[PDB]
Amino acid sequence: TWLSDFPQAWAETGGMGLAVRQAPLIIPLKATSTPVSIKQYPMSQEARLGIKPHIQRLLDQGILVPCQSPWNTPLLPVKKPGTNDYRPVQDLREVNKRVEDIHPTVPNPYNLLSGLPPSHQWYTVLDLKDAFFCLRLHPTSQPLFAFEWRDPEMGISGQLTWTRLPQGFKNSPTLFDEALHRDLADFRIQHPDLILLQYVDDLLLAATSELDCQQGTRALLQTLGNLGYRASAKKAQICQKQVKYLGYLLKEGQR
Amino acid sequence: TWLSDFPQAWAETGGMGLAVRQAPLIIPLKATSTPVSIKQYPMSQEARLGIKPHIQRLLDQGILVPCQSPWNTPLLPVKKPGTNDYRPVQDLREVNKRVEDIHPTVPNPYNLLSGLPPSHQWYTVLDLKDAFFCLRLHPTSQPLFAFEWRDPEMGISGQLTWTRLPQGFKNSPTLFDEALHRDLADFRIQHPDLILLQYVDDLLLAATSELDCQQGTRALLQTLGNLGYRASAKKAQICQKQVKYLGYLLKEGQR
DNA sequence: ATTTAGTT
DNA sequence: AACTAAAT
DNA sequence: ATTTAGTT
DNA sequence: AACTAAAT
C-alpha cells in the first residue's frame, strides 16, 4: 500500500503542501509599470454564495490573507457545469501585462516525450495537487494580486490577496516548473538509471524493471513529501506497463 | 489646317474606318469549348428605346448584321449619367472564358513612356475613334459574339452579331495593338528620327523640332488615313510643347 | 465581465 | 463588420 | 443582370 | 458573412 507507506506524499493524507526549500518568490515588474486598480464587477448572490466556501477555505489555509493594496483585479464567477457550482477565477490580465516577462522554459509535451527511451517500459505517473499554491510569494509581491471580497452580511475588510503563487498569473507554470526542477535535481543525481520527465505539475518516472520503478517510485514519493509537495493518490498510476501522460497513452514505448 | 489637308485621316470627315490591310480576324477557342447560349435578360422599354438608335446606326454601318447562332450573350443597358442616356454593353464574360488566351503584348503605360528621350520635346497626340470596329472579324468567328435584339413593334429576326472586333472581348485591346503595329511598321522605318508610342488606340509622336513634328504628323495622318484608321480631330493635340498622354502631362520631358 | 485572435 | 471561441 | 475580388 | 466596387 503506497498510500499508507507515504502519508506525507499524498494530498489525501498529507495536508496542503508548501515547498519549504524554495525562497518566497519576488515578481519583478516592467520598468514603467504602475499599479492598476480595476473595480470588482457586481456579483449576484448566487455566484457569491457558490464562491464563498472556496474563499473561506483558502483564508483558513492561510493561502489568502486580508490586505490593503493599490492593485486590484476582478474576481469572475465561473461554473464548469451547464449552470451548477461556481468557482473563483481571477482576471489577472492587466497585472500580467505589467509584470516583466521571463524565458518560457517549460518544454512542449512533444519534445519532452522524445526523451523517453525504449529501454524504460515501466512507467509511473503522478500529478501534484494545488502545485502553484505550494510556492510561497514574497510579502513584497503579494499586493500585486489583490482582489475585492465583500460579504453582504459581515464582509472582510475589503481586499484579499495571495501568499502563494496564484492561478491566472502568466508566469506561474514556468516558475513552478523551474522550482520543482531545482528541488528534484538531487533525486536525478541519486537515480542515474531512472528517467524523470516534468511538465509543470505532471510527472512521469520511467524505469527498466518493475522493481526499479517500484523502488524509484518509493524514493520519489518520499522525496516529494519531504520537500513539501503533494501528489494525487486518486489519479496516481503506479508501476504500470501502460499509462496516460500529457494526453498520450504510453504503451510498449509507443507515443 | 490639318483637318482640311487630311480629310481621310479624321473621324469627323473620313467616315467609319476599316483596316483594309488587315485580314479578317479568326478567334481560336479553347480545346474543350462548346457554345454557350445565355437568354437575354428582359429589358425595360426605357432602356430599349435608349439603346435602339445605337443598334440601328451599327446595322446601317454594317458593323452589326442579323444571324442565327448557338452562341448568345446578354446585352446590358448601361447609362453613364445619374440616369440619363443608355448605351449597349454586352456581357461577353462567358464567351471570354471559352476563347483561347493570348500573350498580353500591350506594355503598361509606365514602361511605354520610358522609351521617350529628352531630345524629342515636340509631341503630337492622337486617339483613334472606334478603333476595334476598324478590324474585321472573320465570318467563322462572328457567330461567337451574337446577342438577341427584339423590337416589340417589328423586331429583327432575333439575333445580331458583330462583323468587327467587339468591345467587351478580352483580346480586343491586344489584337488591335498588334494589328496597328503591323500597319505602322513601315512608317517607323521611313521615319528613323521620330519616336512613336502606341498604347492600343492612343498614339504619341515625338520629334526634336517643331518642323519635324509637323512633317511627321502630316505623314502619320496621311498613313493612318490610307490604312483605314480614323483619328479624333476634336481631341487631337498637334505639335505641342505640352500634351496629355495616357493620363500623364508631358512637359519639358517630365513624366 | 472583458479581451483577443479568428471565422464567417 | 457581425459572430464565435478562448482565456483570465 | 451577374460575377468577383476586396473590405468591413 | 453581409457589403462595396468594378466589370462585362
Side-chain angles (χ1 to χ4, degrees):
Chain A
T1 310
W2 302 78
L3 191 163
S4 60
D5 292 303
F6 303 107
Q8 201 187 202
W10 306 104
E12 286 72 13
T13 58
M16 178 60 77
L18 194 171
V20 306
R21 312 282 262 279
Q22 293 305 304
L25 296 171
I26 288 174
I27 306 300
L29 299 183
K30 287 179 176 176
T32 64
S33 298
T34 278
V36 58
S37 178
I38 303 174
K39 246 301 183 59
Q40 173 57 54
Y41 314 130
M43 195 180 295
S44 70
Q45 175 178 286
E46 182 183 298
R48 182 149 36 65
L49 275 48
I51 292 177
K52 182 190 292 185
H54 297 111
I55 297 302
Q56 187 62 244
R57 185 175 309 99
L58 294 166
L59 282 163
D60 293 337
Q61 288 167 159
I63 294 176
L64 279 181
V65 291
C67 79
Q68 209 178 308
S69 172
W71 297 82
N72 199 79
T73 43
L75 216 58
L76 303 175
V78 181
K79 50 183 177 299
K80 287 295 179 60
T83 177
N84 299 53
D85 55 307
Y86 286 85
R87 68 185 193 65
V89 175
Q90 182 166 19
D91 179 3
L92 286 175
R93 287 176 301 175
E94 288 302 311
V95 161
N96 287 332
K97 286 148 75 160
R98 296 166 164 75
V99 168
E100 185 77 1
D101 295 310
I102 58 176
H103 190 64
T105 59
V106 184
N108 57 60
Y110 190 97
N111 294 322
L112 185 63
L113 277 299
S114 70
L116 190 171
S119 52
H120 297 61
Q121 298 284 180
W122 295 83
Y123 315 114
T124 281
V125 174
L126 308 177
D127 58 284
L128 308 183
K129 186 77 191 308
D130 301 311
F132 300 161
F133 291 167
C134 291
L135 296 191
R136 292 170 292 175
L137 253 189
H138 189 90
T140 304
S141 298
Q142 286 178 21
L144 182 61
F145 305 103
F147 58 99
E148 184 184 307
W149 184 254
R150 304 213 60 59
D151 182 303
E153 295 187 59
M154 201 305 97
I156 305 179
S157 58
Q159 294 172 295
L160 294 181
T161 196
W162 311 83
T163 57
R164 308 298 181 82
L165 187 62
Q167 296 255 63
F169 171 45
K170 75 175 178 189
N171 292 340
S172 293
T174 298
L175 294 172
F176 179 83
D177 197 60
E178 300 179 344
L180 186 56
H181 264 291
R182 291 194 291 278
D183 279 344
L184 296 177
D186 184 60
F187 172 92
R188 288 173 181 285
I189 296 178
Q190 303 299 169
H191 302 278
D193 298 3
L194 294 177
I195 289 294
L196 174 62
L197 265 48
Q198 306 181 216
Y199 185 73
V200 191
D201 54 9
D202 297 303
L203 313 177
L204 176 67
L205 186 63
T208 301
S209 66
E210 180 174 58
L211 175 61
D212 283 5
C213 190
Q214 285 176 50
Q215 297 172 176
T217 294
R218 297 201 188 76
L220 174 55
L221 290 170
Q222 179 63 197
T223 301
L224 289 170
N226 293 169
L227 292 173
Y229 297 101
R230 302 290 184 263
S232 176
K234 169 63 181 300
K235 303 182 176 180
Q237 301 173 70
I238 307 183
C239 300
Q240 301 296 296
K241 293 262 58 183
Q242 171 191 297
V243 300
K244 294 180 181 59
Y245 184 61
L246 303 182
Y248 290 87
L249 180 63
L250 286 48
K251 176 184 177 181
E252 312 165 3
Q254 286 302 64
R255 275 192 158 187
Chain B
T1 310
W2 302 78
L3 191 163
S4 60
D5 292 303
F6 303 107
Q8 201 187 202
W10 306 104
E12 286 72 13
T13 58
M16 178 60 77
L18 194 171
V20 306
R21 312 282 262 279
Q22 293 305 304
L25 296 171
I26 288 174
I27 306 300
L29 299 183
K30 287 179 176 176
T32 64
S33 298
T34 278
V36 58
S37 178
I38 303 174
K39 246 301 183 59
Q40 173 57 54
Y41 314 130
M43 195 180 295
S44 70
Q45 175 178 286
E46 182 183 298
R48 182 149 36 65
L49 275 48
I51 292 177
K52 182 190 292 185
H54 297 111
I55 297 302
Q56 187 62 244
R57 185 175 309 99
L58 294 166
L59 282 163
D60 293 337
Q61 288 167 159
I63 294 175
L64 279 181
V65 291
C67 79
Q68 209 178 308
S69 172
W71 297 82
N72 199 79
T73 43
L75 216 58
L76 303 175
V78 181
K79 50 183 177 299
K80 287 295 179 60
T83 177
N84 299 53
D85 55 307
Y86 286 85
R87 68 185 193 65
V89 175
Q90 182 166 19
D91 179 3
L92 286 175
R93 287 176 301 175
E94 288 302 311
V95 161
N96 287 332
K97 286 148 75 160
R98 296 166 164 75
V99 168
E100 185 77 1
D101 295 310
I102 58 176
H103 190 64
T105 59
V106 184
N108 57 60
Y110 190 97
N111 294 322
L112 185 63
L113 277 299
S114 70
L116 190 171
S119 52
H120 297 61
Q121 298 284 180
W122 295 83
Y123 315 114
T124 281
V125 174
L126 308 177
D127 58 284
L128 308 183
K129 186 77 191 308
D130 301 311
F132 300 161
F133 291 167
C134 291
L135 296 191
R136 292 170 292 175
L137 253 189
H138 189 90
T140 304
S141 298
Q142 286 178 21
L144 182 61
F145 305 103
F147 58 99
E148 184 184 307
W149 184 254
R150 304 213 60 59
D151 182 303
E153 295 187 59
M154 201 305 97
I156 305 179
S157 58
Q159 294 172 295
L160 294 181
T161 196
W162 311 83
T163 57
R164 308 298 181 82
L165 187 62
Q167 296 255 63
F169 171 45
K170 75 175 178 189
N171 292 340
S172 293
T174 298
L175 294 172
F176 179 83
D177 197 60
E178 300 179 344
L180 186 56
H181 264 291
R182 291 194 291 278
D183 279 344
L184 296 177
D186 184 60
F187 172 92
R188 288 173 181 285
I189 296 178
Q190 303 299 169
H191 302 278
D193 298 3
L194 294 177
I195 289 294
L196 174 62
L197 265 48
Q198 306 181 216
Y199 185 73
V200 191
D201 54 9
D202 297 303
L203 313 177
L204 176 67
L205 186 63
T208 301
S209 66
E210 180 174 58
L211 175 61
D212 283 5
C213 190
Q214 285 176 50
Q215 297 172 176
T217 294
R218 297 201 188 76
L220 174 55
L221 290 170
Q222 179 63 197
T223 301
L224 289 170
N226 293 169
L227 292 173
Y229 297 101
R230 302 290 184 263
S232 176
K234 169 63 181 300
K235 303 182 176 180
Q237 301 173 70
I238 307 183
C239 300
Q240 301 296 296
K241 293 262 58 183
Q242 171 191 297
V243 300
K244 294 180 181 59
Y245 184 61
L246 303 182
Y248 290 87
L249 180 63
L250 286 48
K251 176 184 177 181
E252 312 165 3
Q254 286 302 64
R255 275 192 158 187

